[PDB]
Amino acid sequence: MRWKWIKKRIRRLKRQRKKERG
Amino acid sequence: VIRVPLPEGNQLFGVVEQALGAGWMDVRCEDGKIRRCRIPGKLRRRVWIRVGDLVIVQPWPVQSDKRGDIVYRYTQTQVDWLLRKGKITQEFLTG
Amino acid sequence: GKKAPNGEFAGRKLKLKRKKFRWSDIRYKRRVLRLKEKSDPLEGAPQARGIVLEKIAVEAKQPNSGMRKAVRVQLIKNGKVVTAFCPGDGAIKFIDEHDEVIIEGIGGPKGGSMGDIPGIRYKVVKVNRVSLKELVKGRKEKPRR
RNA sequence: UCUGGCACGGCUUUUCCGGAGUGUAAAAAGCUCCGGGAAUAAGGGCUGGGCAAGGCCGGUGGCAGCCGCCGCGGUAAUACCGGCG
RNA sequence: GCCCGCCGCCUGGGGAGUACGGCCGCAAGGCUGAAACUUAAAGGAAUUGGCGGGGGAGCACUACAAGGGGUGGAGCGUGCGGUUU
RNA sequence: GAGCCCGGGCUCCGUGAGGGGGGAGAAGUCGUAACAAGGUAACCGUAGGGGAACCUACGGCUCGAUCACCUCCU
RNA sequence: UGGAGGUGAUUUAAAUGC
């Protein structure tokens, strides 16, 4: 679980933060 | 003697196109429309329907052209009987 | 020391504590801001008239299936799209499209649609300023336009 | 049908009609006095558990509906609709 | 435990430790931190039972070893699956 | 000394292609992740990698594993 | 009589069910 979520949250964050940074 | 249910009122013959999940099926009907159909529970427990089965459909009283409930499923020999009485056409079943 | 300062002059700490910790009641926070009043259209009100855009029927929930009678109505000043649950058996009949339909809530404003219905926040009382429970009984009055 | 109900016999008579002043400082309010005078406006909700405070018949059949929650309707439903209680 | 003093934090679940804003950080990130919506649960301890590709003890002869015989090879008898009618 | 106007800046209301997530529907598909040591114990912070559940490294923790082996304690 | 460590560990036993 919290492994999952942390990396899902991180990937969401990055990918989206990539989309914001871009 | 063989006896086969037939569509009563505004009920329609249909062929099951796609399984959506959760007792909802897309059904191609005999008037030419695809209805999103519900399987009443009283039915789901009694039978195992599948893609490319022929059914009776009861359209809903609102959005008659888009939704219905499947109300009876036909076995393979009933489907043959409905082909031989001219109730359904072989061209309708295949699609 | 079970929490709190106790001491003559301290009280202010008390006084701010409570308030700080009050805002963990969703309900309290919400009213004191007025989120109850802003979001779930009405502008807060008891009821709202609106023009019946169309009639739609939706599915029931998890152990259940049955066609509930729901309208789509547009509140007039609110100017917001509301889908809605209609009391009574026959009813959907007595409601013509483009009659006025007064609308209320149903069963705690919290958001809670009743157990069966997914969405429906609201209730309908009226068709052309005469209600639905009056139109379930044949004698009392019967509809127009 | 003894919670109560009905016949029948007797009593009284809220509203309602008419009169006196009133009040008006003009009415109305018609009250209040007196004469006439009828047993003559009652309903709404609920009755599964919660809450019980309250249960049968007939229809219907996980439908149509009920629903504040917990649930109830999948062919003997006390929970839905109607009736009866 | 029972008292006395202060401090941090909590106020059902999920949404979400996310969005936005600000602050910090080279970067990776951190600190702070909602709402719309949705649900009659989320949860904790212990009890029982069933279960585990867990451990000990003990039996069995529908068990296995040990052992004697045999089925499965053929012909026939029989009952069946199927096919035929 | 008002309203009025003009040019620019900032903010807020009605409304928009497109885009994000939630609680769901539970008849399609992939896998077996966890819950029994779940059949490689599990979780945990951090880092990389994988379609997915997830795997691996390093450090921690037992809310940790079943005998066995060794060590202590009323 | 009941509790805590340190390390052998065992692959001969296979995904799913409204």
From Swiss-Prot, chain B:
GO molecular function, one term: RNA binding
Keywords assigned by UniProt, alphabetized: Initiation factor, Protein biosynthesis
Limits of the S1-like domain: 1-75
Keyword Hydrolase: no
Family recorded in the similarity comment: Belongs to the eIF-1A family.
Function: Seems to be required for maximal rate of protein biosynthesis. Enhances ribosome dissociation into subunits and stabilizes the binding of the initiator Met-tRNA(I) to 40 S ribosomal subunits.
Name of the protein this chain belongs to: Translation initiation factor 1A
Species: Pyrococcus abyssi (strain GE5 / Orsay)
Lineage: Archaea, Methanobacteriati, Methanobacteriota, Thermococci, Thermococcales
Residue numbers of the full-length protein present here: 13 to 107 of 113
From Swiss-Prot, chain C:
GO BP, sorted A to Z: translation
Keywords for this protein: Ribonucleoprotein, Ribosomal protein, RNA-binding, rRNA-binding
GO molecular function, one term: structural constituent of ribosome
GO CC aspect terms: small ribosomal subunit
Function recorded in the entry: With S4 and S5 plays an important role in translational accuracy. Located at the interface of the 30S and 50S subunits.
Family (UniProt): Belongs to the universal ribosomal protein uS12 family.
Cross-referenced NCBIfam families: PRK04211.1, uS12_E_A
Protein name: Small ribosomal subunit protein uS12
